[PDB]
Design a protein around this ligand. Structure first.
Ligand SMILES: CCCCCC(=O)N[C@H]1CCOC1=O
Ligand SMILES: CCCCCC(=O)N[C@H]1CCOC1=O
Ligand SMILES: [Co+2]
Ligand SMILES: [Co+2]
Ligand SMILES: [Fe+3]
Ligand SMILES: [Fe+3]
Lengths: 277, 277
């Protein structure tokens, strides 16, 4: 039986309007007609599965050259979704401390292609990049239409193409994919974005874990009841996905790891302290 | 050839958070982390078609007993979506000034069953009430689960049932319905709410008119580009509906009358000044 080790890697912090994360979280009233929102902070992280069959990476955080005047992100983007991270937080450094080079990664699973998950895809030229086909198509249209604003970074996409990444698209109606012993890719479909992927991992000692990414921002999103994000591509799809994750967790007695939950993240054992067997 | 007269009836004004009407209209930034929304005012109105084949009413505004301590609307609702109207603004009074009694109405078309469109359904006991089946089912579930908050008013629904209204549901996949010479019901389906209906009218002198209701809040919603509302049941469905309306307007050279557009409403000839032939 395979005895993998799973690492949680801290890739810094982001802030944005709380309305993005929880829609109409604090609506104006007759007694508060100019209601104020908040500017909340949350973690960006990635997960490495050191599996005997090969190393698997879930998400890739933000590109190190995202912020600043010479940054890849448009000015309006930087102001609405600012990212802060020290050098040791960069993905390539986190991996380095584990004695892992990018070239050692067999599979990268991209939950979706937003700026905070697909930032460092270009690094893994020796891997197969697993992504939802609808998410891929949508991003490429953004590129082709020369969209310089939004959550799809023109400069990042440019780099993927130039670096000749090897893509494996998950089809709209494609089943879950067994990646390795006790590791399965979940096809969540349209919701938060054009197409979302998750991961289910079964560890001998710790048991089952579901990586939900932005299918579920936080425990507050999860509920119940469900509290959806401010902007959504497919509201119906989003609601269905959350409830599907809940069912899976119950039936397999698995933990659910959210995309950007500050409190949950504090509890994790990170790559600087150890791993999950 | 039939020569109808179409009347626009002013049924008062409402206010709410602008984020309801235009999602993320003013997002927080690093420089404005506690961004403020606004509390915007907009008209509630209904349309009467005095047709030789019979009188047709589109929407019914709010119930006269909605607001106040003894009001049908929950406190939280009254504070988030306050309605103001004088006595002459009440639907029953507007009709009276045209020498029209509720019993004279042959057809009522309910665009949807929100508090500001289905308020006075209970009045028209001599009419056939045309509504989307999915919208009807959803409202009845709110009632059955004893939901006392939200945009579906428990007390309003209660009254419909007690007054023994005569329902004709539009099926999910049912075609447009010819109601009378030059009057057609449009099935928009799920979007803003569970199920939306519109109307297309062809007048000898004025030409074509599309009544969109909450399928399109305002000219700003309409664009292009489309700016969706803060909360939506079916985002995908909503976007599709707007574009469908644009196509119809172009192909038939029809004006589009929005649900709650203050500027457009000012330009209408109201029932106090005349009608459209
Ligand atoms: C459609 C999803 C909302 C678009 C804005 C965005 O990309 N926001 C990031 C921030 C953390 O996770 C997110 O989705
Ligand atoms: C579809 C969610 C409803 C948001 C609150 C609401 O019901 N607002 C009114 C005001 C005019 O049209 C509406 O739907
Ligand atoms: Co995202
Ligand atoms: Co409505
Ligand atoms: Fe994210
Ligand atoms: Fe409305």
């Amino acid at each position: 039986k395979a005895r993998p080790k799973l690492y949680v890697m801290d890739n810094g912090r982001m802030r944005m309007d709380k309305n993005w994360m929880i829609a109409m979280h604090n609506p104006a009233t007759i007694h508060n007609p100019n209601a104020q929102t908040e500017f909340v902070e949350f973690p960006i992280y990635t997960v490495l599965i050191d599996h005997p069959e090969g190393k698997i990476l879930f998400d890739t955080s933000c590109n190190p050259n995202s912020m600043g005047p010479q940054g890849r992100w448009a000015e309006s983007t930087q102001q609405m979704f600012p990212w802060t991270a020290t050098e040791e937080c960069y993905l390539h450094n986190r991996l380095e401390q584990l004695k892992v080079r990018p070239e050692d990664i067999r599979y990268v699973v991209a939950s979706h292609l937003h700026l905070d998950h697909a930032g460092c895809l270009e690094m893994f030229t020796n891997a197969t990049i697993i992504v939802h086909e609808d998410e891929f198509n949508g991003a490429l249209q953004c590129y082709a239409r020369n969209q310089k604003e939004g959550a799809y970074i023109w400069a990042d996409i440019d780099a993927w193409i130039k670096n000749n990444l090897q893509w494996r698209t998950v089809k709209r109606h494609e089943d879950n994919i067994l990646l390795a012993e006790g590791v399965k890719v979940l096809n969540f479909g349209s919701g938060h974005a054009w197409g979302m992927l998750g991961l289910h991992v079964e560890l001998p000692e710790t048991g089952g874990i579901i990586l939900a990414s932005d299918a579920i921002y936080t425990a507050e999103s999860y509920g119940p009841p469900i509290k959806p994000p401010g902007i959504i591509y497919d509201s119906l799809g989003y609601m269905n996905t959350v409830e599907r994750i809940r069912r899976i967790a119950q039936e397999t007695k698995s933990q659910v790891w959210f995309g950007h939950d500050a409190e949950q993240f504090k509890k994790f054992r990170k790559s600087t302290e150890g791993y999950y067997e």
